[PDB]
Curated annotation (Swiss-Prot), chains A, B, C, D:
Cellular component GO terms held in the UniProt record: autolysosome; autophagosome; cytoplasm; cytoplasmic vesicle; ferritin complex
Name of protein: Ferritin light chain
Species: Equus caballus (Horse)
Subunit structure: Oligomer of 24 subunits. There are two types of subunits: L (light) chain and H (heavy) chain. The major chain can be light or heavy, depending on the species and tissue type. The functional molecule forms a roughly spherical shell with a diameter of 12 nm and contains a central cavity into which the insoluble mineral iron core is deposited. Interacts with NCOA4.
Family of the protein in this entry: Belongs to the ferritin family.
Lineage: Eukaryota, Metazoa, Chordata, Craniata, Vertebrata
Alphabetized SUPFAM superfamilies for the sequence: Ferritin-like
Binding positions for Fe cation per the UniProt entry: F52, E55, F56, F59, E62
GN (gene name): FTL
Location of region: Catalytic site for iron oxidation: 52-59
Length: 172, 172, 172, 172
């Protein structure tokens, strides 16, 4: 490449893997969103929360691909694994699965940041810091806040709590 | 001092003590606010109620300091004690602690008003009457209203009630 | 904690200590501001400079507390020591004390950045870089500029110079 | 009188005396204002400061007279003594004479407040508290601030300092 400078093959490959992880996360959120749109689930705010995250993770993948080309690396796409479940249980089950997924993406971001620091690639490090690390901490905090509110609403009237959370916390 | 007139050393010292009490109350409300922002507490309206009071009590301290200088007294600052708790329990526990704190500030206002009246300091008396006494009665009434609503919502579904109070009474 | 990830106990504790340092600095600036509002000091622009810094340092403390919760750490508050002086001397004395205070806060920021780098905590490092390190360098440069102008105005007519600096450099 | 209620002859007479004191103060400020308009004095900002106070004290007298009639007392006017000086010296001399005058008016306000309190006349007490006592404290603080700035500007270049104070502190 006529532009590539200070961009290791190790970083290039790890960026392609991170693109796959974000596209997989987007797919997981698409499945979560349409589960909550089922006529036998019918939680509009929950559907909208996860459909927004599906678009937000696709955006993250596209930002990584733009950066891959800016650095002179080569995008390489792999098969995208289907999500881990076909049915996602309750809002609580879904929000737990979402925070597990986000902690996995956050650890992948931290791992790539550590590789960039080891390879003295400050453009890679700054790119993650400026576009991903704080967005990810803020999303995980939001999901933790939601999990606590869902948990406090279960009590012995689980259906009432799940309705109220969707109506009074989530955007619909 | 070239301006000081009818301003006793007793009032000057009691004003400095009241500044300390208001700055301590502001600090207590800062701690209450950030407790309700914890991911394992997550009651946004409760966080906002106490963060507003932290700013409101700081304002009261600054108004007292402005008056101290207007009268020709000398601001003297003391160490600010940490709040009484690191964790504040439920919204009910927190709102009870807040009304105990406000009754303590109100008694300090009444004590300083009585000293000013004994020292025939009508500017001090009017300053408290016009800027503090009614604001304090109105805040205590608001907190009493909130305590009654929180208490009526406990029943046997405490988590549901605490969610509903935060969602439907407090500003978020 | 259900959200905490890559957030060491060492960083958590150092963040709480930095919150204390910023709240102490805010308190120091409150005392400086009201000293310059005394009828026997009466330098409005100097009062406003330090009152603005009192609010700016409180803001910094609140930003650290927000981040502490975003990361899943626990805010812990300590007693806030009174400022180092009750009377602050001349504008020159005050601006020297302010730059000593700011260099102490800047070294605390640099120390926490170095701890975050040692603990491979890039979110902490980016948070300080993006919200504190450049703001602090810019504030110290401004104070250095002011110290030089105050020093050039002393000559043998110190009162004239102190008036002129307040009138023609500081906002009133 | 068909309206008079709870309004002692002692208060009525003291209100008429206070009207005389405010009209005398207005006259003193008229003389101060026109002294600073002399071609051999020529300090426009100083002239404007004292001309504003002449109008402000006339206003205070008219507010007392309105209240005298509202209470059913009878305005009684006495001769208005000429001001204490025909020539007022420097801005410093003038601002010292002004603070002596204002402390005398403030003590008269405090004396009438104490008489009203002794006579259980709360309308009189509230009238002074709401319209006079804080305005007077604020004016005396402003004059003290000005005296300190004038004093710091004397040094060994008195004419330079007096020019600069008029140009850079007073409104012209
Ligand atoms: Cl699979
Ligand atoms: Cl303590
Ligand atoms: Cl100390
Ligand atoms: Cl006479």
């Amino acid at each position: 490449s006529q532009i590539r400078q200070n961009y290791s093959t190790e970083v290039e490959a790890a960026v392609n893997r991170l693109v796959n992880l974000y596209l997989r996360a987007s797919y997981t959120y698409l499945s979560l969103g349409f589960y909550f749109d089922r006529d036998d689930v019918a939680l509009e705010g929950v559907c909208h929360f996860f459909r927004f995250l599906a678009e937000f993770k696709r955006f993250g993948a596209e930002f990584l691909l733009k950066m891959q080309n800016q650095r002179g690396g080569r995008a390489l796409f792999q098969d995208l694994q289907k999500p881990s479940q076909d049915e996602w249980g309750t809002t609580l089950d879904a929000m737990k699965a979402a925070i597990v997924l986000e902690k996995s993406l956050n650890q992948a971001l931290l791992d790539l940041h550590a590789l960039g620091s080891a390879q003295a690639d400050p453009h890679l490090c700054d790119f993650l810091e400026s576009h991903f690390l704080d967005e990810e901490v803020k999303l995980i905090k939001k999901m933790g806040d939601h999990l606590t509110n869902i948990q406090r609403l279960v009590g012995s009237q689980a259906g009432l709590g799940e309705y109220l959370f969707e109506r009074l916390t989530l955007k619909h």
